Each structure stands twice: as C-alpha cells, then as structure tokens.
Amino acid sequence: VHLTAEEKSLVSGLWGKVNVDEVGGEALGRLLIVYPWTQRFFDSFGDLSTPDAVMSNAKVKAHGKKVLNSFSDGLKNLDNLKGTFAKLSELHCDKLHVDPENFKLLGNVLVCVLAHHFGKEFTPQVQAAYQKVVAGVANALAHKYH
Amino acid sequence: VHLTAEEKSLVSGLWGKVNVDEVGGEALGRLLIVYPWTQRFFDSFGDLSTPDAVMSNAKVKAHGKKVLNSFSDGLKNLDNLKGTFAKLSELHCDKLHVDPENFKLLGNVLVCVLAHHFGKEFTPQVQAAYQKVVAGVANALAHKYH
Amino acid sequence: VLSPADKTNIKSTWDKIGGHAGDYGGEALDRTFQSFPTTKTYFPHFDLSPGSAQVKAHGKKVADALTTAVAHLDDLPGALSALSDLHAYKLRVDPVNFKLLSHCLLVTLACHHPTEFTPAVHASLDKFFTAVSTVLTSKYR
Amino acid sequence: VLSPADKTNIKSTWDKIGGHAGDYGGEALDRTFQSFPTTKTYFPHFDLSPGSAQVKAHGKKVADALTTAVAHLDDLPGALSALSDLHAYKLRVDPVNFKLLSHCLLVTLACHHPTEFTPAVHASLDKFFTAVSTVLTSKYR
Numbered sequence A, B: 001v002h003l004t005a006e007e008k009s010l011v012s013g014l015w016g017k018v019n020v021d022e023v024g025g026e027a028l029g030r031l032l033i034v035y036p037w038t039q040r041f042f043d044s045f046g047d048l049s050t051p052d053a054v055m056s057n058a059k060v061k062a063h064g065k066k067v068l069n070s071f072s073d074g075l076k077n078l079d080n081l082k083g084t085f086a087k088l089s090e091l092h093c094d095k096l097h098v099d100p101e102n103f104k105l106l107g108n109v110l111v112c113v114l115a116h117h118f119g120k121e122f123t124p125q126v127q128a129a130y131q132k133v134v135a136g137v138a139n140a141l142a143h144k145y146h
Numbered sequence C, D: 001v002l003s004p005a006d007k008t009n010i011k012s013t014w015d016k017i018g019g020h021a022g023d024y025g026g027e028a029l030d031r032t033f034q035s036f037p038t039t040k041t042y043f044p045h046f047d048l049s050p051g052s053a054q055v056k057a058h059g060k061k062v063a064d065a066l067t068t069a070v071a072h073l074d075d076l077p078g079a080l081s082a083l084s085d086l087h088a089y090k091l092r093v094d095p096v097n098f099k100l101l102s103h104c105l106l107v108t109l110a111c112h113h114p115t116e117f118t119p120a121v122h123a124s125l126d127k128f129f130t131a132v133s134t135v136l137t138s139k140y141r
C-alpha cells in the first residue's frame, strides 16, 4: 500500500461524503446478486432469492454498515492495514473459510457503488487511489493465508 | 508459510532426488504449452510455436535451470522467503510486469512435474507440503505489488 | 448463459448510452491504465497520457466492437471471431486483463448513468462483459 | 474449444486408466482436502479422514460423471446439466474450487501414468477439466 500524499487527499476527501448507513448495504447486496455463490456464507440472513429480497433484507443492511465501519478504520490506519485487520483476517480464514478472491470482488463492487453515487467526481484519478486501498484491505484480510 | 517439522522433512527429503538440470526446463516448457499467453514474455527465446519446438529449445532448458536454482535457494531460506525473493520480486513486477496469477500457475505445473517424476512417492502428504512452499514463493515474488 | 431478461437489460442500457459509447470506450481505457498499470504494457506504441488522441481513437474502436456484440447476443462467437484470433494468437493477452477492463467499463457506465445502474442491470452487464471476454480468450482453451 | 487431437488425447488416456478411475477419484479428493483445506467446508457430513469409506465412495461418483463426459465430448452441457443445477443452485460452490480439484485430478493422473503424461496430453486434459468446470458453473454466468 503506498498512497502518495495527493492520493491520500483524494481518498479522504471523497470518504467524508460517504453515507456509511447506505453504501455498506448496497455493496453487500450487489455482491450477493452479481456473484451468487457468496450467498452460501449468509444462510442465516433469511430470504436472499431475488434482487428485491436481498435489497430489502434488514440483516444485509445491518451487516453492511459493519463492513463499512471496518473500512473506515483501515482508512485511518492506512500504513498498518495488516495489524488493523489481523483479527478479522483470522475470522474470515479460520472460522469462515472464505476464499480470498472474494475479498477482491467485494472491493471491486464497493468501487462500483462509489462511482454510482459520485458520478463524475469519481474521476479516473480518484478511482486509481481507491483501487490501491481496496487491494490493500483484501491483502491484509488474506494475510492469515500467507 | 508454516511447514511443521514433518513437512520440512518431506519437502527436503524429496528435493534431494530432484534432477535440477531436467525439472526446471520441463516445468517452464509445460507452462509455455499449457498456458499460451505466457509465451509473450519469452519472445527472445526463439521458436516456441510447437510443443516439440518448446521442448527442444535450448534457452528454455537453460532458463529453467536458473528458475529451479532460485527455488532451491527459497527452500534453504524457508523462514525468510520474502527477503530471499525481494530482488526477483522487483524484477518480475517492475521490469517484467508479469501478473502474479502466473506465479501460481508455474508453481502448480512444477507440482505436476514432480508428481510425474516421483509417481507413488509423491503422496497426498508430500503434495500438501509442496503446495505450501509453492504458494509461499508465489507470494514472496508478488510482494512488490502489495 | 444470457437469459431474455439479461439481453433486455443489455439492449436497453446500450440504447441509453447511445451516441456516447465511443467516449465511454476511451474513458474506460483511461481508468484501466491508471488503476492497473500492468495493462499499459500492451500499448508501447501509444501516447498513454489522459487526453491522448491515440487512446480516444482506440476507445471508439473498442466501443464499436461491443455495439456489434449487442446486435448479435445470440452469436457472439461468430460476430467476434476475428477479434478472438487477434487477441489470442497475435497479441497473446493474459486473460486476467479482460477482468480489469471489464471492471472499468462497469465503473464508467455507473459514473454516467447512475439511474439505470440498478443491481439487476449491474448483474446483466457483468454477464455481458464476461461473455465477451470468454469469446476473446476462447483460443486458449 | 476441444479439437480432434484433444478429444483423441482424452479418450486414449481414459482408456488407459480404465478400471482404476474410481480409485483415482477418491485419491484426487484426498489430495484436494489435504492441499486446500478450504474445500473440506463443503463436506461437513463426511468423515474426511484419509482412507474414509465416504470419501472413497464419493470419488467413485465423481469418476463416473467424468467417464460419462468422456463419452459425450460433443455435448457436455447436455450430459452434465443435472450436475450443473446441483453445484450452482443447491450447493453454491465457489468457482475457485473447481480449479483446485482439477489440479489434483491432473496430479493423480501424473502419479499413476507418467509415460502417457506428455506435455500434449497434459494440455488436453487441462482443457478437458476446464471444460467440465465451466459447464458445472454455467448457471452463475
């Protein structure tokens, strides 16, 4: 994870306008819809069968807010993502056995959700900075596999 | 990389019978044949077009022997693969721009080559230990992207 | 596979992009080059800076090939056969690159048409771009 | 794509393994469970120990499905459609797992038939296993 000073400003600047109550649920919801096999991990969330069901599922919205909060923690500790996500790495790998490739998929749909919400403010430069952050988080989460 | 005592023994035990002049060329040759896009990185090696052209190509055999020797180096330094491969990490990422996914593919065909050569001695237990080493090397080489 | 709903979501979205397809092709390439530097390797003869006329012109050609695909959803292999040869045989593009570009193509469409970009449309478009990539890499397997 | 040389390499090799197919199915699963622990997650109802009767019996089923595929190289989607629904719809298998099992199936074949495991045969079998995996995950795309 590098993030030159300009990149850090681009990242933090945009993140201050993010509605963390909405974005998290939207990103998790789309993951469940676009990549169907991920639903296997959320058996306990109830009805996920259709796009509408996923998008109105209260557990999806609530867990999404939690996933988003973790990202906000990683953004404040960008230079020690590893330590910040050490405990969550153990969870996803040890107890959940989620293949790491899925970390990258969630990171990518999060990027699509941000683009969807910010329109042209999400410039090619802003996206590039976020691609670095998202790859950094996926990496830190996959650590307990390295 | 973990490699519990017993795994270390299984790994080094078989590596002592490995003909480093053969195996390296066989693994690189098969990578070029099974995954054709990898040939792009070896334009300077001459004729690669056919499976037999690849298998008789002198540069392939010679470069393979070099790739195999660096693996032997990683096997001695299992503790710190990261430092052992730091310089090579910079090469493949910086100057070569080889996507990391290909490090995993070469690691896996090396496993196929060992199985082909050892038959029964390459038990499920031995393979598992080697799958950990190969994942370790691929990760150390992809370090310059993390 | 591409079900009737998918095809409808694909055609309907392209209709909305319309005259802007070419612009989008150029912007998606820009996003690809900036986000994933490894991709610039395939374009050494291009001036790879941001407004570049070379990038813009190439984006128009990529967008035109996709429009052709939209018109032939039932026969992508036939409609994209020549491009399959080009990419697999001549250029030898690493399959991983297709995912990278596909992602930036989705981001570009989300940036410009947030209203049409529903979860259902996002899923159909993803299926579309993956179907195109599969055909362009079919000579590897 | 699956070309005439490929099909010939596939049929010839399966003819060689013959009566050992079932044993190979069980062994490949063992190799998968030991090398890639995440895969054991789909078999909580199995005694996942090394010569287990449950693993051996399931391996025979997997080997039988592959034998059926070898007999229907021209129509893999038709011959494996039921299994496609099982894996995609009911089990929800992560696509990544198919690559892991395919690799262990190749290793098993390499271990037992070193002589027929030439670079050309290795490439044809990988194409075969990748073709089967694609059909078993087609409901996702």
Ligand code: HEM
Pocket: A038, A041, A042, A063, A066, A067, A070, A071, A088, A092, A096, A098, A102, A103, A104, A106, A107, A137, A138, A141
């Ligand atoms: C790449 C970014 C990811 C981040 C930052 C992340 C973060 C989190 C957080 C904060 C929790 C804690 C919930 C608790 O208190 O138990 C959690 C739990 C969990 N995560 Fe993730 N996660 C990520 C990716 C994934 C992926 C891709 C999957 C699987 C498709 C997944 C599956 C789970 C599951 C099943 C739980 C337990 C949920 C529950 O029982 O309520 N996560 N994750």
Ligand code: HEM
Pocket: B038, B041, B042, B044, B063, B066, B067, B070, B071, B088, B092, B096, B098, B102, B103, B106, B107, B137, B138, B141
């Ligand atoms: C297990 C993974 C790998 C290892 C351990 C490895 C090791 C090496 C070593 C030792 C060299 C330097 C030779 C010297 O000392 O001069 C090298 C060079 C190189 N590697 Fe790899 N490599 C790996 C994977 C790959 C892959 C997957 C590709 C790309 C498809 C690749 C492409 C090259 C090229 C093009 C060069 C040098 C070009 C030349 O000498 O003309 N390597 N690698």
Ligand code: HEM
Pocket: C039, C042, C043, C058, C061, C062, C065, C066, C083, C087, C091, C093, C097, C098, C101, C132, C133, C136
């Ligand atoms: C959706 C997938 C893609 C589409 C539809 C697409 C389409 C095309 C088309 C239309 C051409 C133009 C040929 C001409 O001059 O008439 C082309 C050329 C080319 N493509 Fe792609 N492509 C795709 C993916 C890729 C990827 C992922 C890469 C690599 C990063 C790539 C690299 C190239 C290169 C280097 C050329 C030569 C460009 C030039 O010199 O003008 N393509 N592609």
Ligand code: HEM
Pocket: D039, D042, D043, D058, D061, D062, D065, D066, D083, D087, D091, D093, D097, D098, D101, D132, D133, D136
């Ligand atoms: C080449 C690919 C594969 C083939 C040919 C294959 C074939 C089959 C067959 C024939 C069955 C038996 C159906 C039944 O009697 O219920 C089955 C069931 C199943 N497969 Fe696979 N499969 C493949 C890959 C996978 C993968 C990658 C996984 C996941 C790690 C997997 C997990 C299962 C599970 C959980 C069942 C149910 C087993 C049981 O309850 O006894 N399969 N598969």
